[PDB]
Amino acid sequence: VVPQYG
Amino acid sequence: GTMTFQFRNPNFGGNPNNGAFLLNSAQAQNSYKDPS
Amino acid sequence: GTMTFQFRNPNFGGNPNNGAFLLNSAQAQNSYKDPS
Amino acid sequence: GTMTFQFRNPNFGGNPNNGAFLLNSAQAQNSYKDPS
Amino acid sequence: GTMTFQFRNPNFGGNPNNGAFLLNSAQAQNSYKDPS
Amino acid sequence: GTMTFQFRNPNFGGNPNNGAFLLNSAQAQNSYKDPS
Amino acid sequence: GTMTFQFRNPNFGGNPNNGAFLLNSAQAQNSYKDPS
Amino acid sequence: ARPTLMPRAQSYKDLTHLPAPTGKIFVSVYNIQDETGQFKPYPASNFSTAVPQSATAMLVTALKDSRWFIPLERQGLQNLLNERKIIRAAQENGTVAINNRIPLQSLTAANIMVEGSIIGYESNVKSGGVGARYFGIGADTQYQLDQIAVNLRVVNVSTGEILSSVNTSKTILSYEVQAGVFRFIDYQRLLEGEVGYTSNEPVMLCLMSAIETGVIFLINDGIDRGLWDLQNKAERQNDILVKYRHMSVPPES
Amino acid sequence: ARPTLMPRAQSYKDLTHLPAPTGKIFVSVYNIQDETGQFKPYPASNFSTAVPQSATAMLVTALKDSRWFIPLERQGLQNLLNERKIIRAAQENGTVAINNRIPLQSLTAANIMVEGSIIGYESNVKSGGVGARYFGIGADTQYQLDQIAVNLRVVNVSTGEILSSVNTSKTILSYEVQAGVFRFIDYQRLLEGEVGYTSNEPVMLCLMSAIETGVIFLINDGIDRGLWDLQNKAERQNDILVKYRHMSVPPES
Amino acid sequence: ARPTLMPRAQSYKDLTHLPAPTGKIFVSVYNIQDETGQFKPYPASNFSTAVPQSATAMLVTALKDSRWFIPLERQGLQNLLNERKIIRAAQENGTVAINNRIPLQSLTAANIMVEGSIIGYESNVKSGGVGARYFGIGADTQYQLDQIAVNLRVVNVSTGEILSSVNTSKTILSYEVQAGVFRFIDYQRLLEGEVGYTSNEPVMLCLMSAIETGVIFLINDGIDRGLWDLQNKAERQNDILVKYRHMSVPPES
Amino acid sequence: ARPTLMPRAQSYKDLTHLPAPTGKIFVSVYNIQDETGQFKPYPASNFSTAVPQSATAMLVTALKDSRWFIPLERQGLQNLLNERKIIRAAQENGTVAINNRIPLQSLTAANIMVEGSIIGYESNVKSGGVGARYFGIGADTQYQLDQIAVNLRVVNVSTGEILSSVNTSKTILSYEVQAGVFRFIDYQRLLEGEVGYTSNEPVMLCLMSAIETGVIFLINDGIDRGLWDLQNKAERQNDILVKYRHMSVPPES
Amino acid sequence: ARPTLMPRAQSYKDLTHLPAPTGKIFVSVYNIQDETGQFKPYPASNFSTAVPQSATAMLVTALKDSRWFIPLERQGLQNLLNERKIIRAAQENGTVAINNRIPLQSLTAANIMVEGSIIGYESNVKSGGVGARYFGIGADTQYQLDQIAVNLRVVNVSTGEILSSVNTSKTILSYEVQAGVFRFIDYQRLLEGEVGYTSNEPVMLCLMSAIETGVIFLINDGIDRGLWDLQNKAERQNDILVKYRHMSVPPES
Amino acid sequence: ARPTLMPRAQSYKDLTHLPAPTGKIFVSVYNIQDETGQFKPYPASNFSTAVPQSATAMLVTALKDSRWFIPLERQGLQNLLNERKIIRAAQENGTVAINNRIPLQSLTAANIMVEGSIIGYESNVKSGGVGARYFGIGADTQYQLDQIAVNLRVVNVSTGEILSSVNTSKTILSYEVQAGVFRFIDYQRLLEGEVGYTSNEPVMLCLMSAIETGVIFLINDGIDRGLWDLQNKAERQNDILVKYRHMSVPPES
Amino acid sequence: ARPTLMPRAQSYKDLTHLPAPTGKIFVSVYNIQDETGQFKPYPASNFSTAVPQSATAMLVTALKDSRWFIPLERQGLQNLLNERKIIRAAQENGTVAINNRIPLQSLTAANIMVEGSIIGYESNVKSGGVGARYFGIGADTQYQLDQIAVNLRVVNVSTGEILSSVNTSKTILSYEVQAGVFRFIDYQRLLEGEVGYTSNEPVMLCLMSAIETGVIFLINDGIDRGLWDLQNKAERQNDILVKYRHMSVPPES
């Protein structure tokens, strides 16, 4: 994955 | 590519070379005789 | 693009090639006979 | 290479030089006499 | 060098200057009289 | 310099301007009358 | 500068424009009548 | 005329209504070069490129409207670092103005970085035309269509591998409709008329819609390979996603 | 003729009467490049660009008249730092003149920095013309319209993210009206006349009005996303703002 | 028209269904130069190259869809190292954002690196045409075919030797079909018509299919010389592999 | 002919009789670039610019005659620093000549620095012409008008903000009047005559008058916003100032 | 059409079946420059070279298929050293991935290094044509042949002497066959036809076969001068070797 | 022909008889650039400038003949410093020749430095012509006049302010007179003649007279503003000075 | 033809018989640039300059034959310093050859240094021609004259002032004489002939004679202002000197 910050 | 509009008639803004073909193709087509 | 004004008549400042078409299209149109 | 479409007729958008050959090759081919 | 194919006839895609030579060389060669 | 071969005849791949000189120089040379 | 040799005749490798002057200057010079 | 927003194709209305993720992804777009190598032919100038050199600023807009990405400006990074040097050199002294009194935080850096190019431009793929004239009066049409192609690939900035890469295409249609009259109406009079119209699709606008298509192919592929999650598994079957999932099989020629 | 102010479109009268904010925003505009890549065709020179290279000085003017921004000169920053070096090297000695005796404060630096480009220029999008001649006497018209597009994006200088980005467009209209007479009036006389007129919209002026439109799209979007506040919440429904808020849906083609 | 995926030839459907390996091979593709040296002739611009400059981004896509390779981005390595410097300089301070709090690992580096060039482009290898006209009515065809060639070689990064090298070719076909009428129908009337159509194969698309062919020649040769193993020895006789193994004898002229 | 002063427009007679300030303002003009990007078309050379590259030396003259500014030479600053190095290196030794025995003071530096560009040049905005010929004898006129625009902005050198910015425009008028006779007077004789005359407004001279207008817009705006004071408040209603204050509303199109 | 392997001449079938040596020779090919200096004439672009710039990648392929040499990549040496720096900088830390855990060995370096150039390109060495037309119907042919020449020399890397050097040549044949009819068939009808065909040998392909010939002249000369041994002395009289040993006497003109 | 001095206009005879000062002023002229940007049109070369690049060496001559200035060579300063390095390095040793045994003094440096540019060049400001032919015999004239403008400004080298600045102009007149005969004199004979003559004023010579005028405007202005004194107050009313003082009001257009 | 000395004008015979000084003056000539900026028009190449770039080597010859100056080579100073470094590095060791065993003295340096430029070149200052033809037989002439101008100034190397400066001019005359016959002699025969001849003065030779004139103006002016002395005061009235002293008043136009 790639990190999602929201 | 790019389409530019140009008049095909040298009466308007156009290439003056096809004027001689334009008048010769019209005078080979008229059927109108002299009214007398 | 850019529209430049040019005379279509070689009497004025214009392309000299359509002079022969201009006089031939006018002499194919005149109906005036010789007055006598 | 690259094939571009062009009309071979100066009535449409085309080279105005072959108009004189186009009308001369058609008037050397017509068999139609004057109806009277 | 590089040989590109081109039609020698202005009826097809070709140089429009040799149309007048093409029709003059054919009308100097025909022997066909008018059938009547 | 470099000598490139070119046909001098517009029937083959050649400059179309000397077609009118080629036919005029041949029709000024023929002595053949009409057989009848 | 540099002198390049060129034929002045369009029969050989030359400028095709002076063919019409070459034949007209020769047919204005011949005195040979038709033998009969 | 009066100015307005840049007009959009169906792809922008398709891109805007994408389903919501759980969180947005920080992304840097450094440079998208004009790798076509193609310039415009005659009668245009010898120096004018066929494709505009602004594909970098088109992707960053398209990522921003997608509601999935938060782009970080790296194209004007040399100007952004110069503005922070003007702050930071003044922060040591007491000569700060009323603005920028608070200490600035460092640059936000991204987890991915999408980059790519415009992979070739081909002019006059197809051409044609139909003309016809009866006695004095006739008409003719023409058309030429060009083709453009855009590569986009997503790079993981931690390792350096390339996660996904797509190629989208677009056909630039140009046509022309004309009609003319040159005829002898009743003896020694010459009627004559001409009406024409052309239309060129702007390659500036077809490049924007080819990039907007390539973002939806990037976003939908990430949901497939597990690169990132949607906010709901039930919206896997979204009607915008299944439109761009049944296009994943390429056309044949 | 005599010189005057540069003429303005409806967008400048639209931009000037914007509602008042609480405070102005310091902004730096470094460079707006001509990313169109398009040069002028024949009969113009091969080197002349189609779009002028002065889009940087057009935005800084448009931000200044907006009564919302205080721009800081960063285009002539290399000349501005050289003038302060002439002061500061003289300030250490006693050789200061009567001016500049007081110590200068540091450079004011900005909170945002708007940058962008001219995203493509497309010539001859539409063309047409109607001509008609009866016996000797007739007239004809023509038109060509070009298209320009300008990107503008606002960068937060603290973090580096891009807060908002808009694309505005403008159509440059050029036309030509002409009429001519070539006719044999009574035997062996030739009457002849010609009257024509053209008009090209200046792309220098359409670029200025496409940038002035893009600033109002930037300012109105900031009130929507809460980037900055108006001076009164009751002026959210201003009749200039709702004109540019109902244009936020783009046109379709 | 509307954008879609880039269309593919038979080689991409041939490349996708390759048999599965045991593991994938990390590979770096640095640069594939346009070593043809050929530019486009008249009436195109003097500066436009005949082959697009994007052969690097075409191979990395073709290696990625092959399900055999994991490419690592080295073309944007100068931009990738700049993004990690923004992280790593912030990692020493406490000014990291909520993202990138974890320490990043080093760059993944490859075991092989495929590189190569486009070895020459030759225009108008064959040309021809058949035209014929009877009285007034006739038609004509033409065709020109160009040729492209792509070199690809796999380099072992440990020692520096070249493991395998292949040259693939492709013929770009362009043709034109036209028919015209110029005839005197019944006295003093002139019937006249013209219908034509051309078609150029895009060299952007033939370059993509010449690279996709060269990858299958690279993969199949590695199974022969023991560079890498398939997942099963029984799938040595795969019907895609034996198609590209009976093409290993080159054509003769 | 014999040389004289450069001719001036109405703006220079308008600029010279400005009301007196309390004191003059030191100002540096570094560089005013030709940001038009436009070169001259055929039959001129491909390299000749449409606007002269000397807008820097035109503003410094216009500021000097205004009786409001004391300009400081920064364009030849690299030559001015080299002359002072020849003095200062000789001042340490006893090898000074009879001149320059006294120690020189440092460079006077400015409080403001006006800079700007030429924002675009547009050729053939309007064109037209009327020609008419009766039997043998007739005449014709033509005209073309170009357009130029100049930006000027005043920068505070202490902080770096931009105090005021104006855009002035000017239309370069070119026309041509011609008349000709070609007629058969009495049998087998040919009378023939032609008289013509053209006139081009020099763009060198219209650029000078567009800059001289922009200085009065800069000076009058400073009295409005309180940047600097007049010598008397009663001369706020000066008849030159109210001419350039009722022009502050721009023209509409 | 569909892509395939690059077609080969008789020289590649001649090169592949060379007799076996005792061992292979490591060889580096750095650069083979286009030392012809010749560009393509009209109607091609002024910038397009007559010979492709990819003679380096053609020799390395030809040495590889010869079953005598193991080439080492030195053309992409700057990219190969950059990949090993990414490994070696990570090898010191514990941040190596699962690949490249083992320490890499140094670069394999060669005992010889073959280099050379393309020594001149001459266009239109011979030209001719035969045309003939009887009444209305005829045909014509043409031909032009160009010439290319390639130098290759083997350098001992220990001392620096040149062991052997050969020059191989190749003639690029281009021809054209055309036939046309223009004749009056029965009264006032015009029969007319035209059929033509050209063929250009690709200079991309003749350069490849001139290099493949020069390798066999290099290999066979080494067996003569004792530079390297065959696997058996009885295969000195191989029928491929005696073909290229009785060609060692050059043609005369 | 035989060479002579360069011919002079009325301005050089006007400049030479200026009244005497009390002392001369040392002055450095570094560079006067061709800031016109204008090149010569067809049929001249594309690279030839319209104004010669030697305006620096024209001013230094004009200052020298004025009997008011002592110019110091700064254009060949890089060559002058190299000659003194050859002396000074030999002066330390005993290897000096019979010349230069005495120690040289330092460079004389100036109190002012005049610099400037050629502010624009405009071709074909006015054109015209009158032609007329009766039966066989006639004549015609033409004229074209160009315009040049030169800026000169005096810089105080101590502070850096600009003391005075003037702009001088000059009109380059070119004309042509021609007459021709083509007539049938008595039957089948053709008389024919033609006599013509043109004249171009040299722009090399009009540039020299525009600079010589600008020096008298600089010298006369210094007597007005008290920059320097005449040798007698009674010669304030000199008849050369009052000619250039009643020209200080510029012409109007 | 066979080579010989370069032909000389009257100025070289005028320069050689100058009266004798007391001693010669060492002089350095560094560079005389082609400051005309003018290139040759069509049909010459676009790159060929109108004036040759060898004015430096023409002055050094002209100073040498004058029997007044001893020139020192500074144009090949970079090659002269390299030859002395080869000596001096060998002089420290015992490896000097039989030549150069003695230690060399330092470079002789000069007291003055004359430098200058070619101040403009103007083509077609005057043109004309007279042609006339009666029946079949006639003739015509033409002429064009160009103009060149050379600046030379003498710089004192001790202080740096300019002692004297002169401008010399020269007119390059080109003409053409032609006659032709085209006539019908007795019936159907065409006599025809043509004889022509042109002559261009070489601008290489007029530049040499304009420099040789400028040296005599430099030498004669030095005797007037007391820069240097003749060997006898009685030869002040030399008949070569009074020829160039009564030319010191310039011509008027």
Author numbering:
A (entry chain X): 2 to 7
B (entry chain P), C (entry chain Q), D (entry chain O), E (entry chain N), F (entry chain M), G (entry chain L): 1 to 36
H (entry chain G), I (entry chain H), J (entry chain F), K (entry chain I), L (entry chain E), M (entry chain A), ...: 10 to 262
Question: What sentences appear in the manuscript?
Answer:
The curli biogenesis system in Enterobacteriaceae such as Salmonella species and Escherichia coli (E.coli), also known as the nucleation-precipitation or type VIII secretion system, is responsible for secreting curli subunits into the extracellular milieu to form cell associated nonbranching and highly aggregative amyloid fibrils. Lipoprotein CsgG forms a nonameric secretion channel in the outer membrane and transports CsgA and CsgB from periplasm into extracellular environment. Two soluble accessory factors, CsgE and CsgF, have been thought to bind to CsgG and play a crucial role in substrate (CsgA and CsgB) secretion and curli amyloid fiber formation. To address these questions, we determined the structures of complexes in curli biogenesis system by electron cryo-microscopy (cryoEM), including CsgF and CsgG (CsgFG) complexes both in the free for and bound to the N terminus (residues 1–22) of CsgA (CsgAN22).
To investigate how CsgAN22 binds to the CsgFG complex, we determined the cryoEM structure of the CsgFG-CsgAN22 complex with an imposed C9 symmetry at 3.34 Å resolution. The overall architecture of CsgFG-CsgAN22 complex was nearly identical to that of CsgFG complex. One being a part of CsgAN22 (residues 2–7, sequence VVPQYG) and the other being a CsgG loop (residues 104–110) missing in the CsgFG complex in the absence of CsgAN22. Six CsgAN22 residues (V2V3P4Q5Y6G7) were trapped in a crevice on CsgG surface mainly by hydrophobic interactions and hydrogen-bonds. Using multiple sequence alignment (MSA), we found that the Val3 residue of CsgA was conserved and interacted with a small hydrophobic pocket surrounded by residues I121, L172, L236, and W237 of CsgG. Tyr6 interacts with the CsgG subunit to stabilize the adjacent CsgG loop region (residues 107–110). Altogether, we found that CsgG recognizes CsgA mainly by binding to the conserved residues Val3, Gln5, and Tyr6.
